[PDB]
Every structure is written in structure tokens, then in C-alpha cells.
Design a protein around this ligand. Structure first.
Ligand SMILES: N[C@@H](Cc1c[nH]c2ccccc12)C(=O)O
Ligand SMILES: N[C@@H](Cc1c[nH]c2ccccc12)C(=O)O
Ligand code: NA
Ligand code: NA
Lengths: 104, 104
């Protein structure tokens, strides 16, 4: 079937419902049980790996091929990361540099 | 290779790093860009669907087969949801009932 702006609107509301639910879970200290409920073990592992990739890409010490060898992540995975980082708002990149990199 | 408690410890620290990063993103109003960076479009769609499944399972109006027919989600998916809900801390279930169900 063709793309539907109407269906896109439904998907968008459902996504924000998750975002807002998680926001409130953090406020009540229920984020860990909520994330354990909402994600699979494999998704949780993937997110932990993705943070490492973003940190190393921001750092710029390792080449992308070195990262693949070091973390076990395939090139396709690293590329998705690199492309998403390049597409992010500058303010998010600046904040990630502040929190993920050590002062120096 | 055999399971390693040492590798499990590394995975656990990486997961908490994501959890804590997201916590801080919410505090700075950078959660939307962070989630857009960290998840794929398919994962975001899956999370929106999972919230709907949990809401309908808590509500108890629809049978699991009716849910499959209504939301397009396969039985395997619904079952994972049901099993994870049954395994969650009672305090999380009680909170979900309070926020996902309408007062009545
Ligand atoms: N937003 C990314 C998600 C992603 C996949 N692999 C990654 C590796 C690192 C960081 C983010 C990612 C995407 O749609 O591709
Ligand atoms: N914690 C669940 C994640 C999950 C998969 N499918 C779901 C559907 C609804 C709610 C949660 C889920 C699991 O490991 O299976
Ligand atoms: Na690096
Ligand atoms: Na229902």
C-alpha cells in the first residue's frame, strides 16, 4: 500500500507516548524496570555497544577499521553510527563531547 | 567460548552507561535527538507498538488473538510482552496501570 500521512501521524503519536512514558519513569526511579520490560536482552546489548562506538567516533583516536577489530562491531554498524552522528544537531554533538570525553 | 562473568560485568557497565546518558539527556531536553541518534527507525516503531501492547494487556478488554488482529503484531510478539509483564516488579505494573489506563 502507498505511504499514508495519516498512518505516519499515528506512528508519531505512539513513539512520543514511549518517549513521555520513559521520561516519567526516570522521574519516579522506575526507568530500570521499564527498560527491562520494553527492550529485549539483544537490544540492551546493542545500545551499550552503540554508546562505545559514538564515544570512539567523537574521540577520533581509532580508525573505523581499528574500531571494528577492537569492539567486534561490523563495518556496516559503524557506518550507520558515523552517518547518524554527522546528521545530528550540533548542540547534541557538543553535549556528547562534554559528557563522553574526559577533560583534558 | 564459555560464558564469562568478567564479560558480563563489562556488558552491564556499558548498559548502565546508556541508561545514565539518557537520564542526563532528559534533564537537558536533548532526549529526542539522542534517541534519534541511538535507535533505528524500525526500533522506534517497535517501541511505539510495544507500549500499545502493554496498555491493552493491562486493560484486559481484548483477547491476545484479538490484539494480533487489531494491531498487526504476531502472536510471538504479544507473548513476549505478556511474559515480560508477568515477570515485572509489582510496583512497575501498578504504576503502568496508573499512567496508561484512563481514570474510571
Ligand atoms: N540512528 C541509527 C542507529 C544506529 C545503528 N547502528 C548504530 C551504531 C552507532 C550509533 C547509532 C547506531 C540508524 O538509524 O542507523
Ligand atoms: N522485555 C521483552 C521485550 C519485548 C519484546 N516484545 C515485546 C512486546 C511487548 C512488550 C515488550 C516486548 C523481551 O525480552 O521479550
Ligand atoms: Na577513538
Ligand atoms: Na485490552
Amino acid at each position: 500500500s502507498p505511504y499514508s500521512a495519516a498512518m505516519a501521524e499515528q506512528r508519531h503519536q505512539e513513539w512520543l507516548r514511549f518517549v513521555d512514558l520513559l521520561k516519567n519513569a526516570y522521574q519516579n526511579d522506575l526507568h530500570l524496570p521499564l527498560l527491562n520490560l520494553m527492550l529485549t536482552p539483544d537490544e540492551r546489548e546493542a545500545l551499550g555497544t552503540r554508546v562505545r562506538i559514538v564515544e570512539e567516533l567523537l574521540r577520533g583516536e581509532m580508525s573505523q577499521r581499528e574500531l571494528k577489530n577492537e569492539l567486534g562491531a561490523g563495518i556496516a554498524t559503524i557506518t550507520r553510527g558515523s552517518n547518524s552522528l554527522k546528521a545530528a544537531p550540533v548542540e547534541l554533538r557538543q553535549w556528547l563531547e562534554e559528557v563522553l570525553l574526559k577533560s583534558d
